[PDB]
Amino acid sequence: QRDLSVELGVASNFAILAKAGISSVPDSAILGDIGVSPAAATYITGFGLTQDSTTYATSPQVTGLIYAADYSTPTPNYLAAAVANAETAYNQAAGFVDPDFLELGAGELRDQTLVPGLYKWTSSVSVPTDLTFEGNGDATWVFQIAGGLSLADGVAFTLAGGANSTNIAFQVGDDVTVGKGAHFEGVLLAKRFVTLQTGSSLNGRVLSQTEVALQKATVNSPFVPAPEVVQ
Amino acid sequence: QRDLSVELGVASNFAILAKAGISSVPDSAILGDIGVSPAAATYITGFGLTQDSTTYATSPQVTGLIYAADYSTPTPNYLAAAVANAETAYNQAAGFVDPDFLELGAGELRDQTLVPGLYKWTSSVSVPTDLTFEGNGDATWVFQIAGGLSLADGVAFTLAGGANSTNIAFQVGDDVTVGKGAHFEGVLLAKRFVTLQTGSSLNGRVLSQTEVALQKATVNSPFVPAPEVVQ
Ligand SMILES: *[C@@H]1O[C@H](CO)[C@@H](O[C@H]2O[C@H](CO)[C@@H](O[C@@H]3O[C@H](CO[C@@H]4O[C@H](CO)[C@@H](O)[C@H](O)[C@@H]4O)[C@@H](O)[C@H](O)[C@@H]3O)[C@H](O)[C@H]2NC(C)=O)[C@H](O)[C@H]1NC(C)=O
Ligand SMILES: *[C@@H]1O[C@H](CO)[C@@H](O[C@H]2O[C@H](CO)[C@@H](O[C@@H]3O[C@H](CO[C@@H]4O[C@H](CO)[C@@H](O)[C@H](O)[C@@H]4O)[C@@H](O)[C@H](O)[C@@H]3O)[C@H](O)[C@H]2NC(C)=O)[C@H](O)[C@H]1NC(C)=O
């Protein structure tokens, strides 16, 4: 019943967006664009970046484009808006009041099934086992985590009942780590570091205010609609 | 006392933004960028556009850059966001309830002094004489006009008491016309056509969902902060 949609603005153009840097131990696999701002291109590492034709770059690990804050106009302002929009989104997700679940499992989410609503914690959160999201194509979930977030090696987020991960948002105050072969679902609004350990995969987006590290990770963000030109 | 700020997102990057076209009878003089989307560059007329180096154009009449929806990546998505943000802003300005002034002067604003607040009309609005905005550096005004808006030749909008035109918004449902040598203050959220007649001037921005016509007009939009790069 409650609308806990989070608005992402330009950030919904990005598989990954980071303020300070993005790194990869290859081969990672990214479906969607990636960007850093205010960081310049030197802080996107492990991608073997080739430039054009000079407002973006390409990389074999990115199906899509790579944007850095020191690229040619209008990328800088394109990125600044994505970043500010990402900050706006973080703060909205954190802004929600009157949670439905408070301190659930003392921070440990074990063989859980999460119904739609607001989940808050004052601690870190560990997911030792598979976690299920159940509700309809329109149900929204928001998670407010004041500490860090981890998923144990091999755990999967799975969707049930028609749940859509464009409607799942994680606001996290401290470092996030997705263990090896683990699977993540939703939009990751991280104030600090994010690490996607080897062979981990993520259906959603990663928006970090510091740094994003991928270790042979797979990131699949939703497609962007082609803005339709009037010739 | 009331916060009637309107959020413009990427549109605050633009002196002028239009959906269907921008035209000029030269020399107009624009401080700030201009853009059309979803329209392509063929619909920016009278500007003698030179292209780069291919994601934007220049024109002697534009101190700043020109963006069209058919320019090279990432301009299309840069523009789509500016445009959608402009639509969001229009709808917010129209969305406000409980006006302070309703049907003021039966649509005619004559030797008026407008205090901060919500002004609504179900009609068109004519300004036959100079109009004064009085309030502080933080006071906000919003105008909801269901019909058109005109300023008579030679009339000026003037600011008093520390009023700031970044805090003045006009939402207008039908064509706008600023007469010859007339002077406009504020953000113009126009659902249809906008015409700035010969020698008219505007301190603010013009955001139109159809077409913008300038006739030797002067448009001065607020400066955009350089997003500050981390090399
Ligand atoms: C999870 O939830 C996501 C968030 O909504 C869904 O995203 C999609 O939802 C619908 C999937 O079909 C899409 O709605 C469709 O939109 C098209 C748009 O086409 C054009 O739209 C123009 C307006 O901009 C119009 O001129 C005209 O309608 C034109 O056709 C529309 O045609 C369809 O009728 C339908 O309304 C929606 O656009 C899309 N959203 C995004 C962000 O891409 C996911 O589908 C959903 N997935 C699952 C597994 O549940
Ligand atoms: C009309 O109202 C406009 C809307 O506010 C005003 O716009 C300006 O307002 C202030 C004019 O001085 C500006 O505030 C200043 O912001 C600078 C920012 O500098 C840097 O900011 C970083 C954060 O992003 C920080 O790292 C650090 O602060 C750094 O210095 C700040 O330094 C100043 O202390 C001050 O706060 C404001 O930025 C600016 N807004 C815009 C949109 O440009 C107009 O000034 C006002 N004009 C009139 C005539 O009343």
Swiss-Prot record, chains A, B:
Site for Ice-binding, residues: 45, 126, 213
Keyword entries, A-Z: Antifreeze protein, Glycoprotein, Secreted, Signal, Stress response
Compartments it resides in: Secreted
Documented effect of changing residue 88 to Y: Has 92% thermal hysteresis (TH) activity of that of the wild-type
Effect of residue 195 to Y: Has 59% thermal hysteresis (TH) activity of that of the wild-type
Keyword Transcription carried by entry: no
Molecular function as annotated in GO: ice binding
Posttranslational mods: Glycosylated. Glycosylation is not required for the thermal hysteresis (TH) activity. Glycosylation may increase stability and secretion of this protein.
One Gene Ontology CC term in the entry: extracellular region
Glycosylated position list: 164
InterPro entries, per database record: Ice-bd_prot (IPR021884)
Location, primary (coarse class): secreted
Biotechnology usage: Improves cryopreservation of the human red blood cells (RBCs). Almost 90 % hemolysis damage induced to RBCs by freeze thawing with the slow warming at 22 degrees Celsius is dramatically decreased to less than 16 % when 0.4 or 0.8 mg/ml of this protein is used as a cryoprotectant. The post-thaw cell counts of RBCs frozen in the presence of 0.8 mg/ml of this protein and thawed by slow warming at 22 degrees Celsius is almost the same as that of non-frozen intact RBCs, whereas the recovery of RBCs frozen in its absence is less than 30 %.
Any Pfam family hit: Ice_binding
Effect of mutating residue 45 to Y: Has 28% thermal hysteresis (TH) activity of that of the wild-type
Physiological role: Confers freeze tolerance. Binds to the surface of ice crystals and inhibits their growth. Has low thermal hysteresis (TH) activity, which is the ability to lower the freezing point of an aqueous solution below its melting point. The TH activity of this protein is approximately 0.2 degrees Celsius at 50 uM and 0.3 degrees Celsius at 400 uM.
Subunit structure: Homodimer. Dimerization is not required for the thermal hysteresis (TH) activity.
Family indicated by similarity: Belongs to the ice-binding protein family.
UniProt name for this protein: Ice-binding protein
Gene: AFP
